[PDB]
Amino acid sequence: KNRPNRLIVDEAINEDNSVVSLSQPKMDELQLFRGDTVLLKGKKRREAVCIVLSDDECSDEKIRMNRVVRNNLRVRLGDVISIQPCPDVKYGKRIHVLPIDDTVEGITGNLFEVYLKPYFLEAYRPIRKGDIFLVRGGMRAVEFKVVETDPSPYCIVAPDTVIHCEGEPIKREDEEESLNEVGYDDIGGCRKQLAQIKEMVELPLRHPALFKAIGVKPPRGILLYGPPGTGKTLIARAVANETGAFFFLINGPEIMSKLAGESESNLRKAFEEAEKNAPAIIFIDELDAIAPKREKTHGEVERRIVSQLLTLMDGLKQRAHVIVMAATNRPNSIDPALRRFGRFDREVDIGIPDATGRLEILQIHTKNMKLADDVDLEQVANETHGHVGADLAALCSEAALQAIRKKMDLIDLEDETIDAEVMNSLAVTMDDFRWALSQSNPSALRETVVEVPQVTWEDIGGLEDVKRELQELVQYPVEHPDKFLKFGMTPSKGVLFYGPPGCGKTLLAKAIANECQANFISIKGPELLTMWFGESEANVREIFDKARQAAPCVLFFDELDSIAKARGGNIGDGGGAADRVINQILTEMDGMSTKKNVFIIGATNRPDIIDPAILRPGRLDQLIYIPLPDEKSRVAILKANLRKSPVAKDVDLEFLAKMTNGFSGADLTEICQRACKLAIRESIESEIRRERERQTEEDDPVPEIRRDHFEEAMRFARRSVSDNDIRKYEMFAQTLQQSR
Amino acid sequence: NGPEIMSKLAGESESNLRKAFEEAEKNAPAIIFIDELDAIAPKREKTHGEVERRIVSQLLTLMDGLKQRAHVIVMAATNRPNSIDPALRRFGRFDREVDIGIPDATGRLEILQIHTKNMKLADDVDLEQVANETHGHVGADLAALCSEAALQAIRKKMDLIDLEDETIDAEVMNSLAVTMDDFRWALSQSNPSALRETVVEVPQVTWEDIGGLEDVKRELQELVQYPVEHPDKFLKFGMTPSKGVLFYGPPGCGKTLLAKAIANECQANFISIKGPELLTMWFGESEANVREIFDKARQAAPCVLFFDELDSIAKARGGNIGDGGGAADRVINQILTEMDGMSTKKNVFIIGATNRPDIIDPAILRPGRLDQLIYIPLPDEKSRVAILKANLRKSPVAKDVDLEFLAKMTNGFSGADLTEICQRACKLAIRESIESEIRRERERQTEEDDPVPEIRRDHFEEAMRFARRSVSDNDIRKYEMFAQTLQQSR
Ligand SMILES: Nc1ncnc2c1ncn2[C@@H]1O[C@H](COP(=O)(O)OP(=O)(O)NP(=O)(O)O)[C@@H](O)[C@H]1O
Ligand SMILES: Nc1ncnc2c1ncn2[C@@H]1O[C@H](COP(=O)(O)OP(=O)(O)NP(=O)(O)O)[C@@H](O)[C@H]1O
Ligand SMILES: Nc1ncnc2c1ncn2[C@@H]1O[C@H](COP(=O)(O)OP(=O)(O)O)[C@@H](O)[C@H]1O
Ligand SMILES: Nc1ncnc2c1ncn2[C@@H]1O[C@H](COP(=O)(O)OP(=O)(O)O)[C@@H](O)[C@H]1O
Secondary structure: OOOOOEEEOOOOOOOOOOEEEEOHHHHHHHOOOOOOEEEEEOOOOOEEEEEEEEOOOOOOOOOEOOHHHHHHOOOOOOOEEEEEEOOOOOOOOOEEEEOOOOOOOOOOOOOHHHHHHHHOOOOOEEEEOOOEEEEEEOOEEEEEEEEEEOOOOEEEEOOOOOOEOOOOOOOOOOOOOOOOOOOOOOOOOOHHHHHHHHHHHHHHHHOOHHHHOOOOOOOOEEEEEOOOOOOHHHHHHHHHHHHOOEOOEEEHHHHOOOOHHHHHHHHHHHHHHHHHOOOEEEEEEOHHHOOOOHHHOOOOHHHHHHHHHHHHHHOOOOOOOEEEEEEEOOHHHOOOOOOOOOOOOEEEEOOOOOHHHHHHHHHHHOOOOOOOOOOOHHHHHHOOOOOOHHHHHHHHHHHHHHHHHHOOOHHHHOOOOOOOHHHHHOOOOHHHHHHHHHOOOOOOOOOOOOEOOOOOHHHOOOOHHHHHHHHHHHHHHHHOHHHHHHHOOOOOOEEEEEOOOOOOOOHHHHHHHHHOOOEEEEEOHHHHHHHHOOOOOOOHHHHHHHHHHOOOEEEEEOOOOHHHHHOOOOOOOOOOOOOOHHHHHHHHHHOOOOOOOEEEEEEEOOOOOOOHHHHOOOOOOOEEEOOOOOHHHHHHHHHHHHOOOOOOOOOOOHHHHHHOOOOOOOHHHHHHHHHHHHHHHHHHHHHHHHHHHHOOOOOOOOOOOOHHHHHHHHHOOOOOOOHHHHHHHHHHHHHOOOOO | OHHHHOOOOHHHHHHHHHHHHHHHHHOOOEEEEEEOHHHOOOOHHHOOOOHHHHHHHHHHHHHHOOOOOOOEEEEEEOOOHHHOOOOOOOOOOOOOOOOOOOOOHHHHHHHHHHHOOOOOOOOOOOHHHHHHOOOOOOHHHHHHHHHHHHHHHHHHOOOHHHHOOOOOOOHHHHHOOOOHHHHHHHHHOOOOOOOOOOOOEOOOOOHHHOOOOHHHHHHHHHHHHHHHHOHHHHHHHOOOOOOEEEEEOOOOOOOOHHHHHHHHHOOOEEEEEOHHHHHHHHOOOOOOOHHHHHHHHHHOOOEEEEEOOOOHHHHHOOOOOOOOOOOOOOHHHHHHHHHHOOOOOOOEEEEEEEOOOOOOOHHHHOOOOOOOEEEOOOOOHHHHHHHHHHHHOOOOOOOOOOOHHHHHHOOOOOOOHHHHHHHHHHHHHHHHHHHHHHHHHHHHOOOOOOOOOOOOHHHHHHHHHOOOOOOOHHHHHHHHHHHHHOOOOO
């Protein structure tokens, strides 16, 4: 018809297996309501009946499409479908649905009331003939095929019908695949990297003939890496099985497990077999087993194997319908002659996930688990700092095995055997989650983390003008390069905080990285000391390579004065005013691109004994005095700390605010900690006294703090900063020369 | 190709190399090409097995045994000259040496002119922008950049517009152009810059970019430009020319600009070495790098070699008291030893620079070495107005503003201070203009009458309220000691 009814498929955000979400101007163009019965026609004359729903997440012309119904239509991602309303659907009297025997194995008991009757209630579901849907439960996920309906050829189902499920399972026909093949639905986290790998490879695989009409070379050597266990083979096979090409898998240890000429014949026949079924993808994992760093290679057959791989990958420039993906452990653990132009050009890091990614990975792995009601995935989302996803698979399987181990093993073996009806009753508790998270958790990470921070501007009290002109200093030229191009001034890229210790030096950097949606990689002082004492400075280049790879980002140096204080004070050691790591930092600083959005933030508390070679233009040049807090900042900081804890309202904090002057913010965030420790000790002792009183039940004495704890904490209080350091810093206010 | 010859067995590789040289003998005249020589003949210490030395000896015999023939010629290509076996590049085997090097902005413009030949650009695309904004790239990155922008123009418009209705032909490929937005997008992300090493190019700053300092410029022109054009006069009067010059002065007086102007006017290459390079060669105790630098310098003939912050190695191990040592170090005497052992006429002219002329080693002030001393003083008011206009020529400024008030007020100021105060005022003006822009946007709309494209007296007055001198008086007296005393030989 060539009208807007020809639409492009996508992934779905909805979690029902038969609903389709669409946008508002599109749905106002088609004149429907919510919950209408809609019909989809695609390729090879297949049909889909669905419920339509409305969402603003959809764009102008796309369709949020589920995987089981897109495999029901026998189409894939990148195909076009046709949309028609079918508003004349009645109810049925008999429903014929039956499994395929290849996915129901080990199963005993009745199948009908355990799955079908928990499914076909309360959801009027549109079913057409020959359809295969998918349900979960029983620690499993089973698909189901329908055969016959009374209102031919489709109906909507309701509580007011029956389903006749009689018969034996039927073998799967030759055309479709199973649904235990992995896909785009079961990879939690790292959505941007998946989008980048999706957009980089879509054209020569979905439209191969276009590059048979245009001679422009696509990128063919694309290399992803990451710390191990993160499922690089999983995402590789997911992209290859989702976009629909021929797959073949070369693993490094198997090729090293043969003789010499047998390995040569294996690699040659593998590349010929990948040539035969074009278009196709090819995958080499554990490249460290095949082509290591050259200094770590000692024999003779290994260099011959690496030269064989170089000739075999240079000799497929003529072909353009295969593409090579590979996976190592680290980019510094490959031979440097391999990753060059014509062999391996594109580079992508997977990285470790974060709390949102951990929540999504946990949402993947409790899909067919049948949780309880008291289990709280936000708890084990926030309490699981520093983990990879295979540890999360181990954690979920460990909690499931603990629920099998405590109740229902010895309860059942004394009387009967085990079926799936009692597997329906099995849920797991949060106690097994806390038990599997307390012990038996080998945390597989000690390295540097990269994430967006969470502290916002309202978490720090006051300091308002400094926040707004820092916002001027970073936020402006990334949004308006035309004004700077008009006035010809290149922007500065350095800023140097300084101030007395204990004034909240990390919080403003966290707020700037959180508001502009920037990554964050921090380096403390102890990292500088363990890079100085070991005399190892081939690590700074790795840090700034990671920084450029995490573009955009803000790089935070904490305790820069440690290397100048460590070898003596202001007299110092026998040396002078320079060192090793700081000039290595300058040399790797000034030799990079101006527009790459890597913004370097330094910090110290001793601004006099620092090397003045860092205050050159083109480097760190912006100085901001961070002073002691004032009383309005004191009440603001005190409320911003006390917002987490339950406090009383009759207590008054302006007495101590008007009393305490010249105090660090760290002191006024530890005195509340001291008072709350005193209150928690008082409450637990009154708890054990009322327990031992009549019983040798819960009327809580107080959930908050009174004036007594604050008065005793002020009797335990202490200032942290002397007056002479304030005069040493106000020397810079009196003198004002700060260029060099 | 090297990897293919290493991909066989031993006698098969021998038969392959022998049949290759016989086949190159058959169709004389012909050329022959061996790339990735690092795969065939590496450095000898990195070779460990047995068949590799046999292969290298086979190559040496096979190239010595074609001296009788004269109708073939061998060209080869490695990665680095320090990564070949040293027994290979000798007389009778490999005599001539030529560096390709990295291109520059003119070369980048020409390479981009190569790769948009059949591209059908738009009208708004500006190749000068991505010529000047692409510092530090090789040409394969430029091929990747042009193909990436073309793939982005295929990815945004015309993929999903076309697949919903019809198929793809070339009549719609005629309508396809690319925009500059895809160029900025492919240049912002997905640009692995493949270079960190030293660059060699002609500079662009001319004599009019620095204000005043006229007599010093003309007798420096006497010092460098004269004997390359008139060797007959020096041969007549028998004096060999000096080849060293030592700038010195207080910090912040434009020390790099005169060196850039001399290298730009006489059409000379330029290789500079800052102070941090001297510190990372001293602390690591690695001095097999100076010889590489002067080999690159002789290979870049003619050129001018610039040392910046020479006083870093004398200040780094203590001040004028120093460390436990004395008045010498390691890198500077290595510099002297590689300096005096080279040809007089090779047009390698060495320019040194410091800001502390007293604590430097006086062994460098010998004849046949750096001997010419030029006091670079503080700017004067005519140099102040000249330097201020030479900085402000880039920015749009108003004409009713007057700069001679602050010029007659500011005395004893560095040129760096009077090129950052304009930067501070223009940051203040760009903040004022962007806030008035967002206020007029949020005023009636919650269209473009520009309030001001230039600077008024208010920004300069506030920048003078934020102004600061950078040099004290006692350092001027410490330098004018050399004017009062005048002994400067050793
Ligand atoms: N509102 C606040 N005001 C001040 N400090 C705060 C505030 N909120 C949190 N902090 C604490 O301040 C820390 C930031 O370090 P900061 O206290 O400024 O350095 P420092 O204490 O002066 N030097 P040091 O403690 O030895 O590393 C954070 O880690 C918090 O523990
Ligand atoms: N007309 C000018 N007069 C003075 N300085 C200028 C002028 N034009 C540019 N400059 C700046 O002067 C710099 C040259 O270094 P220079 O300022 O002489 O060394 P220095 O500032 O005294 N010592 P340092 O800044 O610590 O490396 C250039 O990089 C420019 O930023
Ligand atoms: N983010 C994740 N999503 C889904 N599964 C994961 C994830 N991370 C780890 N896994 C599981 O951990 C295992 C590790 O992946 P694998 O391909 O074996 O990596 P490697 O071979 O490098 O250890 C996989 O079998 C996968 O099922
Ligand atoms: N200056 C240039 N002019 C034209 N093409 C270039 C240029 N630089 C790089 N290329 C492209 O980059 C690729 C790299 O050249 P190549 O011969 O493969 O070098 P190597 O094998 O040493 O990487 C070539 O295919 C070439 O088309």
